[PDB]
Motif scaffolding. Structure first.
Motif, mmCIF file in Angstrom:
data_model
loop_
_atom_site.group_PDB
_atom_site.id
_atom_site.type_symbol
_atom_site.label_atom_id
_atom_site.label_comp_id
_atom_site.label_asym_id
_atom_site.label_seq_id
_atom_site.Cartn_x
_atom_site.Cartn_y
_atom_site.Cartn_z
ATOM 1 N N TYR B 14 133.084 98.709 17.512
ATOM 2 C CA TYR B 14 134.080 97.841 17.190
ATOM 3 C C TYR B 14 133.770 96.504 16.491
ATOM 4 C CZ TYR B 14 136.334 101.649 19.880
ATOM 5 O OH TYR B 14 136.773 103.026 20.230
ATOM 6 N N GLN B 15 132.783 95.866 17.036
ATOM 7 C CA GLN B 15 132.402 94.441 16.378
ATOM 8 C C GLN B 15 131.852 94.850 15.059
ATOM 9 O OE1 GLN B 15 130.167 93.745 20.130
ATOM 10 N NE2 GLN B 15 130.878 91.476 19.999
ATOM 11 N N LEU B 16 131.236 95.706 14.732
ATOM 12 C CA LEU B 16 130.378 95.949 13.463
ATOM 13 C C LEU B 16 131.609 96.160 12.515
ATOM 14 C CD1 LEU B 16 127.677 96.735 12.302
ATOM 15 C CD2 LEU B 16 128.397 99.145 12.498
ATOM 16 N N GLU B 17 132.761 96.892 12.793
ATOM 17 C CA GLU B 17 133.809 96.896 11.897
ATOM 18 C C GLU B 17 134.449 95.674 11.573
ATOM 19 O OE1 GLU B 17 137.036 99.595 13.359
ATOM 20 O OE2 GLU B 17 138.230 98.976 11.917
ATOM 21 N N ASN B 18 134.260 94.653 12.086
ATOM 22 C CA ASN B 18 134.629 93.103 11.883
ATOM 23 C C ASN B 18 133.993 92.302 10.728
ATOM 24 O OD1 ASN B 18 136.583 92.825 13.936
ATOM 25 N ND2 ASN B 18 135.017 92.110 15.443
ATOM 26 N N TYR B 19 132.890 93.039 10.333
ATOM 27 C CA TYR B 19 131.962 92.685 9.358
ATOM 28 C C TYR B 19 132.580 93.230 8.053
ATOM 29 C CZ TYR B 19 129.129 90.285 12.438
ATOM 30 O OH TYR B 19 128.673 89.608 13.358
ATOM 31 N N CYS B 20 133.522 94.128 7.935
ATOM 32 C CA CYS B 20 133.884 95.018 6.824
ATOM 33 C C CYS B 20 134.986 93.995 6.088
ATOM 34 C CB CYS B 20 134.754 96.149 7.168
ATOM 35 S SG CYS B 20 133.827 97.431 8.006
#
Lengths: 25, 21
Positions: B14-20
């Protein structure tokens, strides 16, 4: 070797598939 | 940044998705 650190080209590959059409830059 | 948080440190899916965009 299982671990929780995601680096280099694998980091980009994961970002590419989760962001999809949105992009990341 | 992204390399520091996900490679040096740890980032969940879910944190990875914050870079989108």
């Amino acid at each position: 070797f299982v671990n929780q650190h995601l680096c280099g080209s694998h980091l980009v590959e994961a970002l590419y598939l989760v962001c999809g059409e949105r992009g990341f830059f | 940044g992204i390399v520091e948080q996900c490679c040096a440190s740890v980032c969940s899916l879910y944190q990875l998705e914050n870079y989108c965009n």
